[PDB]
Structure 1
Amino acid sequence: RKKIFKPEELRQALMPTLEALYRQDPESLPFRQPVDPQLLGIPDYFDIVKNPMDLSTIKRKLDTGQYQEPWQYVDDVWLMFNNAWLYNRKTSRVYKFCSKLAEVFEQEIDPVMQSL
């Protein structure tokens, strides 16, 4: 008897965990919109990152019901983190910012998943 989550159920449960990331300043700033390699001056970005992901895209998928299960949402969040850890050097701002967001996320998501 597989459990169905309504889009609205998932938005109500998961969106606050995304808002937790949005709220982190300065750490969220590089994550709030799609990476634009040209504006940023990193033209090898899409050479290396083949599945880009960012907060605004995750928000939009919640807002349009594109996640059928909570793990799909969590996977997109980790996708965004894994892209940043892959592309950026360990000493960089964005790498360290990513690690800060990942710590915040883990603390926020665990209770929500138990609830779901």
Structure 2
Amino acid sequence: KIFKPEELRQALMPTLEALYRQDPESLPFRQPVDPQLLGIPDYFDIVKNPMDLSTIKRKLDTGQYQEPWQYVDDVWLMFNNAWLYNRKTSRVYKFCSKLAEVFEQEIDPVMQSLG
């Protein structure tokens, strides 16, 4: 099944917007983790493939997804990176858990509509 870039954008960008709408939970995710700025040199030792909302948005805007499960994969890579690196008591970790609940609800009917 072929998917057009604008078809993927029209279907999937509302689910990304739903994540941006989460406040405070989306705030640490709207831009890439910056280890130099945050003083965490070990970050890229642990997270070999960073992902964040702005990079997913750019990938959707520049047609880098050929199928919707590639978009889902990048959202879940965001989540898994954050659960992996951050302590379970931290804001980032608990915010990640909230985004995953939101995303699960938003993406389900959209994947049905795509087929």
Identify the TM-score tier after normalising by the shorter chain.
Answer: over 0.9
1:25-104 residue pairs with structure 2 within 5 A?
A: 25-104=23-102
1:41 Cα shift? 1.6
| Aligned-partner Cα distance in 2 for 1:37–1:62 | 25
CA deviation profile, 1:59-87 (whole Å, cap 9, x unmatched):
00000100000000000000000000000
1:11 Cα shift? 0.1
Structure 2, unaligned stretches of length 5 or more?
none
| Aligned-partner Cα distance in 2 for 1:30–1:53 | 12
Superposition TM-score, scaled by structure 2 size: 0.98
1:38 Cα shift? 1.4
CA deviation profile, 1:19-44 (whole Å, cap 9, x unmatched):
00011010001100010011112111
Q: CA RMSD in A?
A: 0.5
Structure 1, unaligned stretches of length 5 or more?
none
Q: Where has structure 1 moved over 2 Å in runs of 4 or more?
A: none
Paired positions, count: 114
1:1-12 residue pairs with structure 2 within 5 A?
A: 3-12=1-10
| Aligned-partner Cα distance in 2 for 1:41–1:94 | 16
Superposition TM-score, scaled by structure 1 size: 0.97
Give the secondary structure class of the aligned counterpart of 1:4: coil
CA deviation profile, 1:86-115 (whole Å, cap 9, x unmatched):
000111100000000000000000000011
Percent identity, please.
100
